[PDB]
Amino acid sequence: GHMARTTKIEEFYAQFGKYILLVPGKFTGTVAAHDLSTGRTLAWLAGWNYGDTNPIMHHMAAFPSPDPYKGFEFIVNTQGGKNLFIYGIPTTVKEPGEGFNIYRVRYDGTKFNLVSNIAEKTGLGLGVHVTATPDGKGFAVADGQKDIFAEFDLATESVRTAFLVDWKPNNSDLKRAWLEGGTMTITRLKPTLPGGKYDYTGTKGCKIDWELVPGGELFLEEGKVTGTRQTNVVALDAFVYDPRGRWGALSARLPGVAIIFDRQDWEPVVALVGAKGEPSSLPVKKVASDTWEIKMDKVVTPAHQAGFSPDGKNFLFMNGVRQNNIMVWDTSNHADPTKWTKKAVVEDPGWRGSYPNTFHMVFTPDGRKVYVTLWWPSPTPNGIAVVDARNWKLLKSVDIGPDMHTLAITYDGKYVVGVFSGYQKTASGIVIMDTKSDEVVGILPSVGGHHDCVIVPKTVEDLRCSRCTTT
Amino acid sequence: RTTKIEEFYAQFGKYILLVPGKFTGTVAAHDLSTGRTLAWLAGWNYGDTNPIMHHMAAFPSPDPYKGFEFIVNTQGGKNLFIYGIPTTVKEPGEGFNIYRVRYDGTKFNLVSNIAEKTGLGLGVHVTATPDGKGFAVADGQKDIFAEFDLATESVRTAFLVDWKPNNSDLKRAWLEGGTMTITRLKPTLPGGKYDYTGTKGCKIDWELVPGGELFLEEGKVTGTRQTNVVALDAFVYDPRGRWGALSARLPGVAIIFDRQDWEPVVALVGAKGEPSSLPVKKVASDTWEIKMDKVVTPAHQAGFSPDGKNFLFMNGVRQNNIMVWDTSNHADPTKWTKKAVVEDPGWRGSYPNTFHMVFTPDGRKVYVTLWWPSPTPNGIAVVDARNWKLLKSVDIGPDMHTLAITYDGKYVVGVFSGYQKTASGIVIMDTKSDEVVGILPSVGGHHDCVIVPKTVEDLRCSRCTTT
Ligand SMILES: [Cu+2]
Ligand SMILES: [Cu+2]
Ligand SMILES: [Cu+2]
Ligand SMILES: [Cu+2]
Ligand SMILES: [Cu+2]
Ligand SMILES: [Cu+2]
């Protein structure tokens, strides 16, 4: 009785409404847009076609468009160098392409158009998270090998600001370089080359020869990561935006700190400390016209993914490995981030091992729930946690597949759309979950190693639940 | 109401779709029972800087979900430049690789580069032999084909085909006929290797596009031997064994080879109104000739029905039809004779270009791609393969390519490919109603697709008997 009828897929797609999913491919080298209303891939682009020999397509953010089906724009970046070598692909390449490109891409209703390489224009080759600003007219990119971030103006493709962050360990032994504390220095960079250009193209500036992979923060302390400035790494990750404006939070994985910046004067203002049992924050002291310091007696655990709720009144930071939890601050005081204080921590008995790590997130538009990926190394199924974002309690956990990454949400709040990525070698897919029932409604095929995904927004209100406020 | 996808996938049964990505540079396997992509591989990761992943064939596996093997090839050179992508690359990678890939239940493994091992870089169709123990690759820029042994990764035979035009004027080089010479190649390098890697041997700088015979005649295809090309396409197999058919697009001929003694035995002539066949004359120990007083039309898609009793060749460009031969006499291909032609008022000229097909296992119907340049909708034709009549045409999307079938005969699975820049997808059609049941997303420019077979009987409706 199991094969009594032919079934058409139309009702499945019809439920989602008119939303376009954008995904980067990591080791596939592609970017693609999928129409969730029809199942068609609207367009794709392959970086190698354009002469990028190492197009590790990493992160992306899309800007609001009045009609995504007629056109939209996004930024997607790449890694480079020896990052080709760290996912177990048995390549014999000797000298990988330099990479670290930042591409502006426009969909025109038919195809993608590679508009510009902002890395080549600006001299900032930055390979980790890309976030749109809340107004949709700028974007930030961070890098965790170079420990640089910058905010860019979209219209002019210009650098608004760039900062370097450095670690000076108390204990010079690699094993203890973070555990026993140190000083974090934050320096506002100035361009050094003609045309206001920075000197950070390609692999230039890397302190370590490849990224700290998902769940691999501690690989550095273990001697598993080569580089010239191993004990000076903080592993910057993202600059996420307060949807109320003015503030952004820079995540630094190895110290487990989120540094709050004033975007209106480009200065750091306070450092939030992730670890459970540690203070809410540490002060930032100005030590020169362009230089600030944070002093830490210890680092309890690394942290990684970070985000504001849609109303900006909560900030989340995911502690990992030494602790696996969701740390929550009360950010309701928009006037003064030095008053932001820890208010809750989400924990679970099942999170007590090294893995799972609390990972990428997305909030419902109404702020009632937050969905959080649960990452594990092979072979444990990865999943999605459903958290009550008013009382800060775990509601449900669901298994999905290997190597779960990002979550997006349709802007009416009805469906979460996520990606899993096979460690660049095994099963991959797009997963869709109904937010009313918290049930998976289906998996779609995906040729991708995606560490990101976005739904193309129509308005700045949509950005509150896109790649702007959270990773 | 929410709707779950389970019932949509549950209707298919346990089949794995394998696809190359063309300009994406990938290959991937999708589980049609769950929607998951089981594995993928990106050729650029391995240092192939122009991985135009082109054609493929998979071998029978007792349990595809536990493991399977396939061959996928690539094109290179100026094939990068024919799809309107505004690349600034000046010197494309040479390409023309032939990769053996194994799925191990978890991942793909790049086992070998047979082009490097053998010295034969061949970039057009890949076909499995009927016994699943060998495969052929043809190339229409070099006009070489070879059949390979899978176990030993060795060349069983290789041939070069050349055209000597009667009229040396490019516009008349095929219309006014010529002599086709077939030469059995011998390796020329140490260790029994051929000297045809990368772009070496190309007569033209890219594979002719659909309708591209006209562009070649009009002087719009670059290359060093433009009037000596025949545009070999595929070596397709008689499912009964013994014979293979080598399609040559420009002369519109299918050359039948004896796979036992490796000699050409007869040349089938596509064009309506022309003879069923022409003789092949041996002129030296390694050389044969076919003489044509004229070429009435090019042809492209070629292949056998599952029982081996019909052979099809699709005329295009100057005629647009499906020519059918009675090949019921397995003993003597010189007796294969034209028996039917499928025509339609809507089939004239170059477009639609009917350049892929798949039969139902029972042989009752054949599904044929209907390809057009942008912006005309592309689709699928359904042909009655007993009475030889067109039944139906269904519009799908832009840039339609290959058609596979589930081996229970229930669903056709095809791919469309956006001209490497717009909409792409996997399309599934119910063979009872001849209706599309759905489209799945696909980051791919695929010009091939296969369903991984379990048995040699499955190969009769896979990338073996047709392309
Ligand atoms: Cu991150
Ligand atoms: Cu990543
Ligand atoms: Cu991720
Ligand atoms: Cu063909
Ligand atoms: Cu095709
Ligand atoms: Cu092709």
Coordinates of C-alpha atoms in Angstrom, one line a residue, chain B residues 12 18 32 60 67 84 132 135 142 160-161 177 193 216-217 229 280 282 293 296 300 346 351 354 370 373 447:
Chain B
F12 CA 10.5 6.8 -6.3
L18 CA 24.6 11.1 -10.5
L32 CA 16.0 10.3 -4.6
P60 CA 26.5 -1.9 -12.2
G67 CA 29.3 1.8 -3.1
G84 CA 28.9 34.0 -22.6
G132 CA 29.7 -3.1 -17.3
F135 CA 33.7 2.1 -21.3
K142 CA 40.1 15.6 -32.1
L160 CA 41.1 8.6 -35.5
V161 CA 38.5 9.7 -38.1
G177 CA 30.8 15.3 -49.9
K193 CA 51.0 5.6 -24.1
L216 CA 31.7 26.1 -38.6
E217 CA 30.7 26.4 -42.3
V229 CA 36.6 17.6 -38.8
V280 CA 33.4 0.7 -45.6
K282 CA 39.7 -1.4 -46.2
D293 CA 29.1 12.2 -52.9
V296 CA 22.5 16.0 -47.0
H300 CA 23.5 13.9 -33.5
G346 CA 7.1 21.8 -35.4
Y351 CA 15.9 23.7 -33.3
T354 CA 16.9 16.4 -30.2
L370 CA 13.9 19.3 -27.1
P373 CA 18.6 28.6 -27.6
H447 CA 25.1 18.0 -19.8

